[PDB]
Amino acid sequence: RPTFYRQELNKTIWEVPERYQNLSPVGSVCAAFDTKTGLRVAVKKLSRPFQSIIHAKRTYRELRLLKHMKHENVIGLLDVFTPARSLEEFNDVYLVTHLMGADLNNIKLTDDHVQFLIYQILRGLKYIHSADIIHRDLKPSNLAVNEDCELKILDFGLATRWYRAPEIAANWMHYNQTVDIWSVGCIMAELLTGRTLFPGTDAADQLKLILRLVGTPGAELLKKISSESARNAIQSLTQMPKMNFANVFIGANPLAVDLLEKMLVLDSDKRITAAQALAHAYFAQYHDPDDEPVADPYDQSFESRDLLIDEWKSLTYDEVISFVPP
Ligand SMILES: CCCCCCCCO[C@@H]1O[C@H](CO)[C@@H](O)[C@H](O)[C@H]1O
Ligand SMILES: CCCCCCCCO[C@@H]1O[C@H](CO)[C@@H](O)[C@H](O)[C@H]1O
Numbered sequence: 452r453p454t455f456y457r458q459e460l461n462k463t464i465w466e467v468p469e470r471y472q473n474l475s476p477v478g479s480v481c482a483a484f485d486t487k488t489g490l491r492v493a494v495k496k497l498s499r500p501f502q503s504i505i506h507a508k509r510t511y512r513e514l515r516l517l518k519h520m521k522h523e524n525v526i527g528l529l530d531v532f533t534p535a536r537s538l539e540e541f542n543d544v545y546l547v548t549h550l551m552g553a554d555l556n557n558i559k560l561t562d563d564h565v566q567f568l569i570y571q572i573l574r575g576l577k578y579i580h581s582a583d584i585i586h587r588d589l590k591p592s593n594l595a596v597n598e599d600c601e602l603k604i605l606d607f608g609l610a611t612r613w614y615r616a617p618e619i620a621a622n623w624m625h626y627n628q629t630v631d632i633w634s635v636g637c638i639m640a641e642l643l644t645g646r647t648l649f650p651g652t653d654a655a656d657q658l659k660l661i662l663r664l665v666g667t668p669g670a671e672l673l674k675k676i677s678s679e680s681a682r683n684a685i686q687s688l689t690q691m692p693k694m695n696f697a698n699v700f701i702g703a704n705p706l707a708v709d710l711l712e713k714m715l716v717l718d719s720d721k722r723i724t725a726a727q728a729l730a731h732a733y734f735a736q737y738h739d740p741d742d743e744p745v746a747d748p749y750d751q752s753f754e755s756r757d758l759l760i761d762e763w764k765s766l767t768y769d770e771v772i773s774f775v776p777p
Contacts, residue, residue: 465545467532472484478497479498480495480609481493490549494545497510497545514528514531514767514770515770520746522575522744523574525575525603527777529549529776532547533771551596551603554596555602555642556591560642563736566736566737568600568642569639572602572638573729573734575602586631589635591641593606593607594638612654613650613651613657615633632723633714633719636711662688666717667690672718673685696715709732713731
């Protein structure tokens, strides 16, 4: 067991191994310097991790997910620790990740640079989707970059509905992984134009802006709508055609416009997948089909289980104890 030290910050007493130095507020998160690896890190102290069944299952879910993620373009876990010497004492969980400089909200980009950023998102997304994980909330604030434009997908703001797929915003009961490809389309459009593609002021406005670009749903899509009231609402909309994307993204690389046309499709079954998108000619200078890895199988069967707090806590403790650093 390493040597721990205690200090007060954020009106809580953080107790961490001495390897982690100069903690400064940025659960809650402190930036730190790890003397063992020499890395700048983010240390997240989970808030009330076992206060209820719901908190405890969320704590387990977060740790399990971070432990699985092992890809250059996805945030991974550098360390997980607790001051507790036993299950009986186990009340606090701290997660350590790479400290990222900035997010994509912070950063006109050149076409070469827009290719590089979107390539990396899709490379990461290929990996996440291969594990049968759906992100659901991809947006510029969940995309971290360093000075060298190297990008990682974050689970949460750091470890707005402008970027959400329309089926999520409309409460669909079933989801494609391609909800995330919609989000990538929105992000790419914004990197091209400098402005938010669909800056809806509320859910009605958001949907109006979307349909203005992509057109109202066609008969092929209406065939797959089980909700009677949904179909009726959709067909009572004033009808409108798909816009020509070239006339929206004036001066963009034609290959960028083509890829956007393939991402920003209302019918999720007709959207390009992350794997397919990596092979699109827009990324020719970056694409390497032998260096776009996939993930080990990820067991989410726990999501279907209903357990007691102590049970979720013991499972989380097991995952802390079994952690092996990268
Ligand atoms: C007018 C606004 C309505 C939004 C329509 C969103 C349609 C999304 O597309 C739908 O996604 C589903 C879930 O992945 C699939 O089961 C359907 O087959 C597919 O057509
Ligand atoms: C004018 C706005 C039209 C949006 C329709 C919103 C209602 C969508 O309702 C959803 O429809 C899905 C498709 O059948 C179902 O999977 C979901 O269970 C249902 O919640």
